[PDB]
Design a binder for this molecule. Structure first.
Ligand code: SF4
Lengths: 135, 47, 117
């Protein structure tokens, strides 16, 4: 329920979904009680949180940040833009980050509320808690 | 001849450290209930 | 760049309001006011008094909310994270008012062509 197993994610703020990310980190919601350290350097991070829409111009740059992370890693696509392309079916928008980087949790919303982002993280933890529990 | 004395000066503490101690009246008083609405335990209901 | 100007060419005027929120996502109601005020000129739509004051008031609450973010992120740039917490403490109050009335925290989608939702 409450695990000392810490998670070190890198928040990739690209659009509006990033503003809601800051509100979750602030004094109103306490995302620390869940063991989220939030390191800023991608070299020492294991969870890639894509918060915002990914433009085709940013796709090669984002993929590089992913391959540059240690192998025990997960990825959370916050909002529909990073999940499936969101409300932008246009010539310059990448329809979902899972097309260039596997994602483990999709958080719907435009943008999701701070609690929705928290529930989404618990879901990632739920997965990991029983990912090392089967085999 | 006779000459009285004054004790005033550039002794700005009569009104400067007074304002600096204002932080002790606000920052110290800011130790109230935590604004945090813990989630998953104790959710904020949407309007 | 997601093609905003090209998305408008394929949508009706009222359908573009939610896309204006996603331009300056920090002050969505302000974006809507600019757009809606423009379309209302093209279509020649008068806005009732109650809505005019609701627009003006909510547009100003967004300006405070937007300057708080610029001040909070501006403070965050030089450490002094204590200002970031206070700035966002006040932003949470403005969002509680906007969310309760518009229905969404950031992308309000409160204005409508002809008044407010
Ligand atoms: S999911 Fe919605 S709020 Fe998030 S970046 Fe995309 S359009 Fe903006």
């Amino acid at each position: 329920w409450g695990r000392r197993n810490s998670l070190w994610p890198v928040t990739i703020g690209l659009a509006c979904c990033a503003i809601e990310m800051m509100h979750t980190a602030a004094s109103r919601f306490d995302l620390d009680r869940l063991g989220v350290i939030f390191r800023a350097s991608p070299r020492q991070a294991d969870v890639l949180i894509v918060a915002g829409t990914v433009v085709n111009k940013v796709a090669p740059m984002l993929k590089l940040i992913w391959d540059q992370m240690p192998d025990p890693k997960w990825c959370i696509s916050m909002g529909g833009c990073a999940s499936a392309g969101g409300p932008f079916p246009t010539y310059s928008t990448l329809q979902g980050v899972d097309r260039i980087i596997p994602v483990d949790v999709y958080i719907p919303g435009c943008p999701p509320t701070p609690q929705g982002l928290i529930y989404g993280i618990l879901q990632l933890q739920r997965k990991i808690k029983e990912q090392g529990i089967t085999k | 001849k006779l000459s009285r004395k004054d004790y005033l000066n550039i002794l700005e503490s009569i009104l400067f450290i007074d304002f600096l101690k204002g932080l002790s009246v606000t920052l110290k008083n800011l130790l109230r209930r935590p604004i945090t609405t813990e989630y998953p335990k104790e959710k904020l209901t949407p309007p | 760049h997601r093609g905003m100007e090209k998305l408008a060419e394929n949508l009706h005027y009222f359908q573009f309001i939610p896309y204006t929120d996603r331009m300056d996502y920090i002050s969505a109601i302000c974006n809507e006011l600019a757009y809606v005020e423009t379309v209302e000129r093209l279509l020649g739509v008068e806005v009732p008094e109650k809505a005019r004051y609701i627009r003006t008031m909510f547009a100003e609450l967004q300006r405070i909310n937007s300057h708080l973010l610029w001040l909070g992120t501006g403070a965050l740039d030089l450490g002094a994270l204590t200002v970031f917490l206070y700035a966002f403490r006040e932003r949470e109050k403005i969002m509680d008012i906007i969310e309760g009335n518009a229905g969404y925290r950031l992308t309000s989608c409160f204005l409508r062509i002809g008044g407010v939702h």
